[PDB]
Amino acid sequence: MTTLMLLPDGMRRWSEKNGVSLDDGYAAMGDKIIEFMGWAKEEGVKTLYITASSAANHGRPEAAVNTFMEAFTEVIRRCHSQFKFDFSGSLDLVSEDYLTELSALRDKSDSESDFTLHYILGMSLSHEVVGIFNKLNGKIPEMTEEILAENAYVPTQVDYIIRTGGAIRMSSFFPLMSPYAELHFSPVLFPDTTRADFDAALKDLRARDR
Amino acid sequence: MTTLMLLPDGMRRWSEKNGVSLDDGYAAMGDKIIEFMGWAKEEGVKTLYITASSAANHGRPEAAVNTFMEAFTEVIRRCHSQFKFDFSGSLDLVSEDYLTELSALRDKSDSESDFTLHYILGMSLSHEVVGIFNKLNGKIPEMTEEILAENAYVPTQVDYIIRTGGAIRMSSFFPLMSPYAELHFSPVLFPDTTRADFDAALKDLRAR
Ligand SMILES: CC(C)=CCSP(=O)(O)OP(=O)(O)O
Ligand SMILES: CC(C)=CCSP(=O)(O)OP(=O)(O)O
Ligand SMILES: CC(C)=CCSP(=O)(O)OP(=O)(O)O
Ligand SMILES: CC(C)=CCSP(=O)(O)OP(=O)(O)O
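^ thats the input. predicted complex w/ dimethylallyl S-thiolodiphosphate below
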């Protein structure tokens, strides 16, 4: 079954366009994620990676960081019984409070579910590689691809990547060990995404086996 | 000014469509690369990175490997005085014959040119990172972003990436230290690229 990575982009522009607070933008994002997970389950996806943040996002003022961390965490608070939950990334950039709570939510999630919802926090290839080197430096005889795969943020290969929000770039979010990922860029702001947008993405992605 | 990375794709399909040998497709690519460098030079790009091959490509049958290595090398024999030439990548996968000649051709090129043509060979993120780790393991106190950048295949940050040939994916070619590279995907087979295709690509890229 399919491994899909979702890059939810456009919450701020959506908030401004609809004349609402950024908090309401992130709440609309959380509701969309829950909706999007349901679509993914119907569509043969077994693992949904969501890029919760780039490493740079965690350098914003703490209140702004707490704002998006709280929105992503609330999704798991509401739906952790509907899937197996895990997270990974630049954990050195995340506060103790959120790491502690997300670890609790992982333990409480349905370990028997066929569907995985996995958050990647603080994505950045340079940060990822730097961290991996400094953890293993002088501790092993040689690096191999198997060892690199074991230490990478994204622990499996990604088949498809969907980026909302109109940017045609990968920013900090390219998955290190996933050379073959097919990319689909949508101009739609993430909180406006419909199932029709998702279905169009999957038809595009599926037709690449011409 | 700007740093552009080109992914030339579609030589096989172009060869079949035009009923010629794969060597002839690669010859057409070489001519197109020279033409494309002229467009790039006129449009103010100062560094043009070209992905000559993925790591996987060097696993192809060995005559096929010599075919693309020869076609890319021929470009640099022909134009190395018109730019500064350099190359990098998974050189452990490249034949020492081409590595010797390319190393000579690098030393040969116009060191004073304000335009750089740089080949990346055997590109692969995992292979790149494994190699960097194994090169520095136990020899430095700690890795930093600056040390990683000094060891990465692509030695500078990439502003724009153009991938021809219709694939909407980065395959083995994502540049490690260039998170903010803007991507442009063209459906045109590389040897079919026209100046209009290049101008449309840059217009899209410049507006972004
Ligand atoms: C979490 C995601 C998918 C995007 C947030 S990072 P961003 O909006 O800053 O991305 P860009 O820097 O704009 O490319
Ligand atoms: C989930 C995070 C942290 C950012 C995603 S949305 P954004 O802040 O980039 O919003 P805009 O792209 O600026 O509209
Ligand atoms: C040199 C370039 C840009 C592509 C050659 S590798 P390829 O044709 O096998 O491309 P894919 O890896 O299959 O996407
Ligand atoms: C430059 C190299 C080595 C491969 C790029 S062209 P290709 O062999 O992928 O040709 P096709 O895409 O298969 O038509």
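The first strand of chain B starts at residue 2 and ends at 7.
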